[PDB]
Structure formats: structure tokens, C-alpha cells
Amino acid sequence: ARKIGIIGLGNVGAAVAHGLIAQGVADDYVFIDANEAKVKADQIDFQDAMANLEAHGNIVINDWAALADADVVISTLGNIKLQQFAELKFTSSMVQSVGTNLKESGFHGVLVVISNPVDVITALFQHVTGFPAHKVIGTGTLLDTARMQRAVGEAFDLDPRSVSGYNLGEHGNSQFVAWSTVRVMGQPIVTLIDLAAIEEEARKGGFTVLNGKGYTSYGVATSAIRIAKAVMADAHAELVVSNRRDDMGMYLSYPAIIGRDGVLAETTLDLTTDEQEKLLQSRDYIQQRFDEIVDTL
Amino acid sequence: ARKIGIIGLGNVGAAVAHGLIAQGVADDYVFIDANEAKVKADQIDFQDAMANLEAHGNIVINDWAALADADVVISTLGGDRFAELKFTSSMVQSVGTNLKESGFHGVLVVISNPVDVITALFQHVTGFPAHKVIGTGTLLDTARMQRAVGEAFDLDPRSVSGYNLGEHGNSQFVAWSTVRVMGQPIVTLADAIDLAAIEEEARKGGFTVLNGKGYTSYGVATSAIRIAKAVMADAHAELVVSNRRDDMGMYLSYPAIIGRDGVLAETTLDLTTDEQEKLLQSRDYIQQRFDEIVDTL
Amino acid sequence: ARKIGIIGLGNVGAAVAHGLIAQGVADDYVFIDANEAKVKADQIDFQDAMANLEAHGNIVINDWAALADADVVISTLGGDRFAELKFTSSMVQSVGTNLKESGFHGVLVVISNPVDVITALFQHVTGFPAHKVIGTGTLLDTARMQRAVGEAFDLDPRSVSGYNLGEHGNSQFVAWSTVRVMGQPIVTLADAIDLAAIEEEARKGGFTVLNGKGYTSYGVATSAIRIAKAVMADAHAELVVSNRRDDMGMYLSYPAIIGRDGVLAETTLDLTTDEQEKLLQSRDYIQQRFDEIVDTL
Amino acid sequence: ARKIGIIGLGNVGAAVAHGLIAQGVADDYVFIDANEAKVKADQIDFQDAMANLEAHGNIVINDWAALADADVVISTLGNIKLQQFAELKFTSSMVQSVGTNLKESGFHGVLVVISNPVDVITALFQHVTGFPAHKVIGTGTLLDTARMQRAVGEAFDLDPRSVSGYNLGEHGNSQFVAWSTVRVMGQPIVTLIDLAAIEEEARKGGFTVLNGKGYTSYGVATSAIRIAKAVMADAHAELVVSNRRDDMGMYLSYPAIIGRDGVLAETTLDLTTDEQEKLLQSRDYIQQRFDEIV
């Protein structure tokens, strides 16, 4: 049967849970949150929906041992008030205990991290749990790429799913659009529009949402659900996620092949020199911030 | 194609939207909200999710004319006491008039508080035939009774029959003479389970949600979604909703047959005399509160 | 993850696989069929559909060891008379033995004819606990009664309660004392509708399907799928399936509580004396036909 | 509400119907088939399924007037027995009456043609109904692209959905794999294996299926359903379908942008000289056999 664990039932974690429960994706769910009254409130509210939902799902709360046979565990803990990377003092303070309980529960599935700064927190989670790096991944620029596809989609009046290409690097700071990989309606977008306008709409689009309602939830929740379904189904799907490539030596977003055991293979992009240059800049940024904080745990 | 309009993109409204978009229920969505920043932030956030979602949906905001061919419209709006009444009736009149003027002729589903009064007010202000104006009512309350009973007998809530009738938010009651579990009327098993305790847990349930979250969303959003699908599919499904029965003359929750035209027929429950008595008490309360608010129009 | 095995990829088995695959219900599928070319054609046909489907599924064929960790296995297998009994009992023993030897320890759902006899035979040969071996039984006849009553009262078949009990295929009957429509027990509405005609209508339909297509598939396939979901989700859902009651000591259709471990509990209907009589008559026929075929093992 | 009509409830027809009903994609369904007892049988069989399905759907049979407000109409009529270009004589006979009835129902949505030979029957359907060419399209090499993605996916142990590229031309004859458009794991397939082996698996893959059970159904039924969903949701999705491009002046498969009004725009691929040549070759066979038939 399918079992998913969600750590941190805030705006994003609760949207992840609603997206999964609304489609009846999993059979068993484990909600874990430091704030007890909140998570119990969400459990009951979801259990009240069950008589009127089409598919059934079981929900247990704050039970680490229940994670032992979970397929996927999604980490959505953090403090959005610190965003309203400065969040690093908060989320990095939480990874030691969350990571140790996770390791101790007997969990051996794939861990998907959303907590920001996603690249650095993904790395510290890998570091505390001791899980193989291919079992610990982050949404990273899967969200950024979806904003890029939305922006390019609006410009050409196309289905965003019909736009190909990726955003690489460090989510929420040096990530960039690899315009050499983007293609729309059979042609490479660079041989076609104000690309920087599109890139600005893509990059500033996330602040517009936070600015408008105080957080972001549907965009990133859906990116996590897509990765969680690829893992459980062992799809061997190519997705841009925050993964540790051998050549990079640090977590950063770059397309990879995802299946039931996590990262099954790396992909290879023919990036311009410009794009490779930016990619190592992101690597260095993540690496340094990670370096400063890993001793502190 | 399927087109759904949602008026009020708050906690309940955004959850209704996410519930529909996660499943790809409708093709076109119309979001209407007084706060342009919030509704615009939600639209962009949902559009960001489209690149990683399985079904596509088109989203327009604050365009009253777009509701003309909407199949269903869901409204989540709802000295100082006098002022509050005056402002609530004003809002229902403005929204209702603009709704009427858009040319919309589908079914209007209201989520609000008190739902029966506000539903009757929308019926009054729009001039839509009463069978096309229904409120979620005790569908949520019934689902909570189903959860409590289900937990008491380690049963799927969907396998618990029976309903909560009357006034949602105050005098509604469990019609225990309609509740069956595992082939037996629960009253019989009670005479040999403590029904009052079960009633306590369901009510207590709602308070835990309010206390830990500050509001409830998944339970009620799912109710509206179930009703919305019955309407678009012309299911002729029996659901307990807030509707105006000829014999009651006011709006209250009682099972009815829902289809593409709204209430297609009424049901007839053989209630006990005490149950029948509570039903009429409920009706008298809704009448009083309706006369009172309609007088501030 | 969710894994389902299907034994016998004929009209029914392929409809079951397509229904599950069109919704992405399981992650892994194991198809077992005596005809290598037919099962291989279906596997390739479904793998050709994966590029245009929303959910992914892995399909392996004729590999018994793969059933070891399957959640559910659905079996669609089913002078002269003695010869046929002999070949049939032999087939159930060969399949049953290989299934038992695979390590499989989930729930076995049997689609056959006579489904109650073949279900009991499989239980007998495998040695699996009776609660883990169930047949679809009269879940398909109940759904036909619901269709016929639903068409009679212009209702949603899902809104018609009640069941068909007994032996699927010959002595099963509508337990009219359990059927309710629009809040009223249908018998009272009959005292005022012709139940006999309704009962006949339901049956006629089955014959209409057999004569126009030569077999029935969607109706019974969907019954198996619903049971399979209740098992993987551990729903504790009340479903009418062929199960072995202590009071009956032989398989027959009577509602029961279904969960991950199969039959979790029995239900107690208050049938009328005629109903109890036909139920026992039904049971005597199943017992006798079972006795006959187990003698040929 | 969503309303889909299916003409011809055979192997492909009933598969399209089950894929939609299992997911609860539409609200209303119109089943039309010359063999009345087979359509009436599937109707009741699906209505028997309804009490145990999660979503509701309404089914009416052989009512052309009910197609007046259908969103999409899928044509899956034919005779698979003749396939075991064989059906062209039979399927061409049907197009006049079916097309006329369809035209007179008041239907004005998108028509999706599956019936083989799909490109020529798509052209005759457009030609007989008088419906704008952009509102009349066929599955074409959407099924063939999916087989290419299966073969390539199997070879690289990838999700078939992660394989990009298209198969162009005429389905079941001159169709080919535009290997310049295919890429896997960030690289061009022709830069990375024997593509002819893969090519053959993909090309012969329909025979194997057909020889193994006597017809093909899930592959093509799912391709039709993907198109139908792009139409009703007005996705503006890039899909390879049989459409009539102006530069070709004849139906053939080439990627197009699909929405509620049918083809909304054409794409332009940077095909190799050879690839360009094969596509025109396909156009001639379609053009020629089309003129030959009417």
C-alpha cells in the first residue's frame, strides 16, 4: 500500500496533504508537527472530509515509528514569518532532531525536502540522517522551472506543459533559466520576445505571490507531489530536483532520473559556457553556507 | 465543458479551488474576491502548479461576465450587531445583484454562517428559483457524525448511514432514527454504545479544529465539491443540503435529490415525534433570523 | 507502493487492468495468463498507452515470484460435466499452489462462476485464512438491482441502499427488506411500484449484455476494483462479497467489513423469515456443489 | 458540463469509453453504433458499473440529436476483421452517411478520427461534413510516437514520458521517426545503441499486439483521450495529430497546438533534409489515395 509522511503541517505541508488526499494518492498518511494543536486540527478536519471524499486515506499524527514503512517522507517544516535563506537559522536548528528521529524510526524510503533554503537543508538532512545521498533530494528548481514555463506559456499562449527547458542552480538566490534548453513549438526559444522580461516574470513571480497572500503553497506542493508519485511508481522520470551530482560535490538543481530508490541516474546537459559558469557559482554559494552551518548541528 | 465560479477566495474558497484543481474537475475557473492582491496571488500560484499537474484548468479572476455560462457557482461569503447585519445583507445584495446581472443561470451553492439564512437571502435577492439556490447545510455536520460513529465502531465513515438535520451552526441535531451501522439501526445497538457521547465527539471535533487552526476548511470545502459534481453530472444523488421544502416554507437541511437543475425532488424521512419536533424548532429559528436580516436590506 | 496481480487476462481481466491503469491506482502490476501471446500483446498495448497517460504503472507478465509482495490478487479464472469439474478443480489447484508457493500473503479476490464454489475451492487449496479469500459474489447483482431501482425512481444508483444476498448465478435474491429509496423503505412504497418487475428488469439486463456482447466485463470488473481499493486503503468498508460466515460455515454473499487483512468483521441484517429461508436454501446449494467438485480433486 | 460522443463501440470504442468512465472524465456520453445490440449491451454494462464507480456519467445510445452540444465526438467505426489499408473500402462507405448525420445533428465541437486509414478518413470526414479543417483532426502518429517512446524508454530504462520527439507522416505506412527531434537524458538520441533496432520495435510493435490478440486498443484509446482532454480544457497543448497544414494542403501528422476550437496553431520543426523528403513522400501517398477514393 502507499504511505506518505509529512513533517511540518503549515501552509505548504497542508496543501501537499490536501493535493494527495483529494486525488486519493496514498492509503496511509503520517502528519508530524511540533505544534500539537495545529496538526490535530488538520487531522480531524481531513477526517471530517472522508465521508464526502471518493477515496479513503488513514491519518495518524506525531508518530515517528509509523514512518518505518513509508515510501516517501516530505519535509515542509520552517517558519514563513522569516521569509515575509534568513530562515536558515530556524530550519537548520530543526534538522538535527528531525533528522535523528527520522533515522531512528527505521525509515528507508526517499526523503523529499521543501524547507528553505532547500539546497542547504537538503544537504544537512543527508548529513544528519546518514541516508545515501540518492535517497535525499529537494524540490529545488522544479518550482522555478514551473514559473518559467508559466511565463513562457503566457507569452506564446501555450500549455505550460508544452514548454521544455530547465532552471538550474540554487533555489531562491542564484538559480537561472538555461535558455539553451528551452524550446517552444518546435523551435529553441533563443532563435525566437524579451527573454529577460520572461525571466523577470519567472524570478519575481514568487515574490508577487508571497507579497500578495503571505506565503506560496500550490506551486511547490504540486512539485513535491509530482516527485512523490515518481518515487512510489518507480517511473524513472527525468525531473529537475536538488540532487548531489558527483562532479558538483554539493547539492544543487540539475535534471536527474527518479524512481523508487531516489536518484537512479544523472543527466547531461550541453550548457553554454555562460550557463556552466553560473552553475558553478550556485555550487559555490550553497557549498559555503553549508560549510558555515554543518559544524553547528 | 465544465466551468466553476468561486466567490470569496479565503480559507474555504482556496481549499475548494485546490480540491477541484488537484483532481482536474473543471476546465474553466472564475475566482472572485474583493482583495485583488490575494486572488491574483492565488491565481498565479495555481498557474505555477499547472506545469506539474496532470489536468489543465484555466483561471480568470474578478470578471463577473465570465460567470454567464458557469455550471455551478460557490459562494463562501458570510449597535454593532445591527451594523453587522446591515453590512452582511448589503454584501449579499451586491454580490447577488451582480451575479444575477451576469446572466448566470446554473446552480448556486452557498457556504456561510448562518448558512440557511444566508442561502435564503441569496435566493431572495437574486430572484433565482429556490431549487437552484442551495447551501451546504448539515452535510458537514453529518460527515462529522459519520466520523465519530465510524471511530466508535472502527468503520469507514462512508459506511455509516443517517443524517444531521435542521439548522447548521446551532439547533441542528443527529436524527439517530436514520443512522445504521453494520446492518443494524444504531438505536438498537444503543439499547443493548452511548449515543450522547458520540454526539459530543462530533461537536467537540469542530472545536478542536477551530482551536488549533482558527478555522475549518477541508471538511466544508469537500462538501461543496461533492454537491458541485452531483450538479454537473446530473446525478440525481440524494444529499442532505440546505433547501426550501414546500412543507417547511423556509430553508433548512434535509435530504433532497440533486441534479443539474438543482433540487430535483424532496425525500421523506419517517422521523420520530421528538425528531419531528426538533426539526420544526430549527425551522422557526431560521425563520426568525431570516425576517430579522431581510429587514435591514 | 501498491502492487496488484491479475490471473487471467481475458475479457474481464483486461477490463480490470484497464480500469486500474486509467486511474493510476497501482504502481506495479503482475499479469498471469496461460496464453503468452495474449498477455504479451496486452502488456505492450498498455505500455504504448503510458506515454499519453497521466499516471505511471509497471507491468510484468507470467512471473509468479513477483506476486510475493502483491497487496491484492484478482483471479478471473472459471462424461462432459465430470470432465469439466475435473479440469476446473485441477486448474484451481495448480494456480492455488503456485500462488501459495510465491509467498503472496495479501487478499485474494475471486471473479468466477460459480464464484462462491470456486472461492471456497481456492481457500481450500491455498490454505489461506478464509478472511483473506473473498469472491465478488452478489456485489454485481446488487449494483444491477440499484440500476433497475434507480432507473425506476429516476435516481442515482449510488443512492439506492440494500442488497442482493446468496449465491451468485442462481439462488441469489434481492433482500427487499434492506432496500431504501428517498428515505423510505421500498416495501412500503410498493404497498402504495412493482418490485417483481424491478427484480426481473435487473436480471433481464444481464441477459441483454450477454446477448449483445457475449459476456459482461465492466460491471463485474468495477466490483473487483472497488473491493481492491477497500483492501489497500484498509477502509473497513461495508461491502457485500462472497465470504465465509461462522453461522453459515460455507461461502455465500452477505455484507462484511473489508480492510487490508480481508474480512475484518461480519454484519447482522434483520432479514424477514422468507429472506432467511432463501438464504439458507442458497447456502445448501453452494455446499452441495462444492462437495461435488472438491470430490474430483 | 462535459459531453463526449463515440461513434462505433468496437474494441477501440469501448476502450475509449472505459478510460473516460473509469476516470469520470465526462458527465454525459452518447454511444452510437450500427450494431444496436452491441451498443445497448455496453450501455447497460457501464450502467451496472455505476453503483461501484466513484464518479457519475450518463449514457444515451444512438441519438444523433444528443450530439448537438457534445464537446468532442470520437469516430472509432470500422471493421477490424478486415485487418486480420484493407478497411479503406469499408470505412469510406460509412463516412458519407455518418458525416451527413453528424453534420445535421447540430454538432459543432471537435471531431477526433481514429478509423483507419486515419489520415485519409480524417480528410474525407472534413470533406463530407464541411466542418472547418481545424475542427476535424485524427490521432495520426500520436500512437506511433507513443510506441517510439516505449521502445526508447525500454532501451534507456526511462519513463516513456521523459522521451521527447515525434514520428511524422502517414500512420500505418510511410510514417517515420524524426530522429533529429528525439532526445533523452538531456542529449540528442542520434549523439548517443542501434536506432534501427529501436525503430523496428516501434514500427512493428502494432503487428505484435495485433497478432497477439487480434486488435489493438489501449494505446490508441489513450491517445484519443489525451486529445479530447486538451480540447475540453482548452489547453493549447502541443500534440502530434493528423491535421491539415497549409504548406502540405493535405492531412498528415505533424505537431499542432490543440484547444477547444481544434487546431489553434501550427508548429515548425527544424527537420533534416531527409526527414523533409520523407514527409513530402508521405503527403503524396495521402494525397493520391485520397483523390483516388473521392
Ligand SMILES: NC(=O)c1ccc[n+]([C@@H]2O[C@H](COP(=O)([O-])OP(=O)(O)OC[C@H]3O[C@@H](n4cnc5c(N)ncnc54)[C@H](O)[C@@H]3O)[C@@H](O)[C@H]2O)c1
Ligand atoms: N523550496 C521551495 O520552493 C519553497 C516554496 C515555498 C515555501 N518553502 C518553504 O517551505 C517551509 C514551510 O513553508 P510554510 O509557508 O508552510 O511555513 P509555515 O510557517 O506556515 O509552516 C511551517 C510548519 O512547520 C512546523 N514546524 C516547525 N518546526 C518543526 C519541527 N522541528 N518539526 C515538525 N514541524 C515543525 C511549524 O509548526 C509549522 O506548522 C518554509 O521553509 C518555506 O521557506 C519552500
Ligand SMILES: NC(=O)c1ccc[n+]([C@@H]2O[C@H](COP(=O)([O-])OP(=O)(O)OC[C@H]3O[C@@H](n4cnc5c(N)ncnc54)[C@H](O)[C@@H]3O)[C@@H](O)[C@H]2O)c1
Ligand atoms: N458551513 C460551515 O460549516 C462552515 C465551515 C467553515 C466556514 N464557514 C463559513 O464560510 C465563510 C468563509 O470563511 P473563510 O475562513 O473562508 O473566510 P476568510 O475570512 O478567510 O475569507 C473570506 C474571503 O471573502 C472575500 N470577500 C469579502 N467580501 C467580499 C465581497 N463583498 N465580494 C467578494 N469577495 C469578498 C475576502 O476578501 C476573503 O478573501 C464564513 O461564512 C464562514 O463562517 C462555514
Ligand SMILES: NC(=O)c1ccc[n+]([C@@H]2O[C@H](COP(=O)([O-])OP(=O)(O)OC[C@H]3O[C@@H](n4cnc5c(N)ncnc54)[C@H](O)[C@@H]3O)[C@@H](O)[C@H]2O)c1
Ligand atoms: N461473477 C460474475 O458475475 C461474472 C461476470 C462475468 C464473468 N465472470 C467469470 O469470469 C471468468 C472469466 O471470464 P472472461 O470472459 O474474462 O474469460 P475469457 O475466456 O475471456 O478469458 C479467461 C482468460 O484466462 C486465461 N487462462 C485460462 N486458464 C488459465 C490458467 N490455468 N492460468 C492462467 N491463465 C489462464 C486464458 O488465457 C484467458 O485469457 C469466468 O469464470 C466467467 O464466468 C463472472
Ligand SMILES: NC(=O)c1ccc[n+]([C@@H]2O[C@H](COP(=O)([O-])OP(=O)(O)OC[C@H]3O[C@@H](n4cnc5c(N)ncnc54)[C@H](O)[C@@H]3O)[C@@H](O)[C@H]2O)c1
Ligand atoms: N488510427 C489508428 O492508429 C488506429 C489504431 C487502432 C485501431 N484503429 C481503427 O479503429 C477502427 C475501429 O477498430 P476496432 O478494433 O474497434 O474495430 P471493431 O470492428 O471491433 O469496431 C468497429 C465498430 O464500428 C461499428 N460500425 C461500423 N460501421 C458503423 C456505422 N456506419 N455507424 C456506426 N457504427 C459503425 C461496428 O458495429 C463496430 O462495433 C478500425 O478502423 C481500426 O483500424 C485505428
